[PDB]
Subunit: 113 residues, 8 copies
């Protein structure tokens, strides 16, 4: 269980050392930051697009080295897409989910992919 | 329900703001324009090739961001391919179908993919 | 002197047998037709984008086979870009230029690239 | 003079309609925000990497359509790289430079590339 | 039913006007020519590699435009791979098969893909 | 049954003549060499990543020419991934497995892919 | 002096072990054989296209490994293009040139690129 | 002065965190080790190919982020190519050069590209 950055933007404690991944992660932080400012459809579309794209890329990256934790990782992703597709306005959930997903599930592939 | 451009060529009211998509759309308008001029096999092959190619590209683009309206969108496409594969010479249908497909189904993905 | 299509849209007489090239050529007919409908900045941008992109792609295709007419062909393209970049509203010139360029200059690379 | 966002993160007013460009722009806001939090080498590296990569990608996109404002735009980029490479710690300058570059220089390529 | 070229090498009557396809076809002719000269494993490996590669590429090309005759076309290919995988030394069959496959099944996709 | 190089690094007797493949093979030798030096998680992650990546690439290469020995080859690979995913510390096994896999199963595709 | 194959088609003695290169080389044998059958524009175009494309691809492969013989090799290619571009109908020269180029100049890059 | 590994193979102390780079670096250790085993043409070719390819790839990665140390880094690479191209059999030099290049010159781009 990790601290929630304030303002809610990416910081170097989240570095995975995969620059493409890190750059995509910065977009997820920004997407949740927007929602935290105005819970509207522009902001949600933005986060939803970035999230869908990042999850698929990250999944491809795992697949390229036949990563052993793929299936659990993909199910985490798919649950979160699902939350976004049924958005409830729970920004707090979303803030926590991302911090924890990166620092525990994404950090796990470092050095294996 | 939208107006049918006369001559039947693309105009900027159809812009999706995805330049690759817009350029492919211009080919669909042209394909239907040809058929409207001479209902023959050259013209139908031309429209059929362009349509098949555009639908698959557009489908790929939706998939890259895990677009939530993919499945309904893909079924729309597949119905229209089917009409082309069983061409009846109904140019009027084709003119309407495209205008409506772009302005209602394609416009829906804007900002999400 | 080739006939100028009316409406000013691509027809199969302009076929080069290179499908990607033909699809790009459709976009150039469309950009000139829009300007013939309303000579404004939007229509010019559209044509100008499609023309710059088409000229570079066709140039790349020529280079891939070390086409002997490359230099002369690139010069013809560059002269038209210059005309678009100093646009005076002479649609007639443009309509003629495109028909002639495709049917006498582009047609010369067929079978060689 | 555009307003400087606070927190200094991307918002949808900076949208260019080019999704890859917008995602890169989010990374530049983030790099400046980190420097505003702690002016150190890690934060500078991050911003410097993201800026060099973004400038080259955007340059490539301009070149793909033979964009007429390329040279002037490349010069603006190159001047900012120089500032990052001779970094004096003036975050204020950077915050202003980015907002202005996007809303007056990048916005000018919209519809042309 | 078409003439069998003598020597068994590609000629321009087999042009599909897809240069990548034509170039791959030249390799198939050569592969059968080798077998006609020495029925050994080097020659068969050569033809088998070229054939496998060409069929898959050609299949991809058909798929990119959602070609309506794909399934019949793919089954033709797969039967011929099968013959090669159970090679009997029937060079005559192979000579006929290729000429007929190109001039009747491959010629069918021209203008549709 | 082949000799085990000492030190356990690649030598030119393992050349497949596919430079990409050979370069990937050098990484597998190195991965097993590391394990032979310190059986830890860094070393195993390194070998596991390289192995997963190589097997998938090599599998793609086989698929591109519709290689007839694919299925047996893929099952060999998948068994070895499985050993790595249930690592027992048997370095001896791993040393033998690789030498034999290359010199008998990989050497088999030479000239067919 | 290497033997000139009759019929003038590629055989496995010309193998370079680079499958893409070998497939391109087959096309150059074929282009010369056609000219030996009928010295016309179609046959020349075919050979000229295949030669320009092959020379650029092989050049790119050399550059990818910073091959030390690049400059001298590029010059040999360029001299042959010049001969095709000033074609005098000397098929004999061409038949000899290709056999020699592959077996003494191309063979020298084997293992180095 | 860094320790020279014995056996002269890559270890995780050389890790750059760029997986493609690390895999290429493994090939350079291997090429020097072979020369240390037998100073012949095969071993030199191997090392020379892997080095030319690695230097160009790493250069491309530097350029993708407009890395500020590019020019100086390219010069260091070019000097080593020159040494390989004028190979005098000084393996000791090579062993030292590689260890030093990676741990002091390559390590400097980490986080910047």
């Amino acid at each position: 269980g990790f601290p929630i950055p304030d303002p809610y933007c990416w910081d170097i404690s989240f570095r995975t050392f995969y620059t493409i991944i890190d750059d995509e992660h910065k977009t997820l932080f920004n997407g949740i930051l927007l929602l935290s400012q105005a819970d509207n459809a522009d902001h949600l579309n933005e986060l939803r697009r970035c999230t869908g794209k990042h999850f698929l890329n990250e999944q491809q990256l795992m697949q390229a080295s036949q990563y052993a934790g793929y299936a659990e990782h993909k199910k985490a992703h798919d649950d979160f897409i699902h939350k976004l597709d049924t958005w409830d306005g729970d920004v707090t959930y979303a803030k926590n989910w991302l911090v924890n997903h990166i620092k525990t599930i994404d950090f796990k592939y470092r050095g294996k992919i």
